Amino acid sequence: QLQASGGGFVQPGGSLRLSCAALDGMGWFRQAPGKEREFVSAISGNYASYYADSVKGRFTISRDNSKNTVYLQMNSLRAEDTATYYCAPQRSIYQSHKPIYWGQGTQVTVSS
């Protein structure tokens, strides 16, 4: 179980850095109100980083091993990016059928 933090209110065009700490496979997910949880980004373990088409170029993920915390710099934030953000460990097919227990997720509001 991982704990996300660092959210708040931001004007369109703005920036925000989210944090997460308690695990190689790790992903960023968000829940917009009235929408289901969707994938935002992930860092694998030759550390491969990938982003959802909706956030490509604008967002960046990076893992700290001096602080055991993964960050998400969200640049050029638009209204659509309003959601409650979460982080969870990714799994192999061998562990695909194991329940997911989410943890804390911060509110990010991108309003003018």
Place this chain on the structure above:
Amino acid sequence: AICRYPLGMSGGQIPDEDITASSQWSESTAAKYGRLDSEEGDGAWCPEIPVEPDDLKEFLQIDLHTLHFITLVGTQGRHAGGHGIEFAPMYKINYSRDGTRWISWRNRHGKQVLDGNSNPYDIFLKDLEPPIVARFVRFIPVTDHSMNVCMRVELYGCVW
């Protein structure tokens, strides 16, 4: 020339029955699930893994029924809505016109093995020069160590 049309993997035009494979880890990871952009089942086709770099015996086979031109291929891993980790870092293309006689696709230079994915999410488009003329196409995941692979594919081209 310009015949880069999707042949039916994500769209569903190539039906379930036309997609076969060497083996499957589970029913949810069956061959039929290896459709580009699909999130059905456990997110991809996964064989009774892992693939051995020495013994490359696993494959995903698509039966096109009529003879096509395959100018481009597209691959993806098991994104499973951000929860999947698996993908094929490399692969090779085998193809038949009768389903009996198999040809290994080779580049203008002579290399068989194509670079695969770097993650389970992003589509990687690999051009085929010379272009393939086949009724049957096989995707063989290729590795450097015994790793778990998963794939979602799409073939691009046109009919004869």
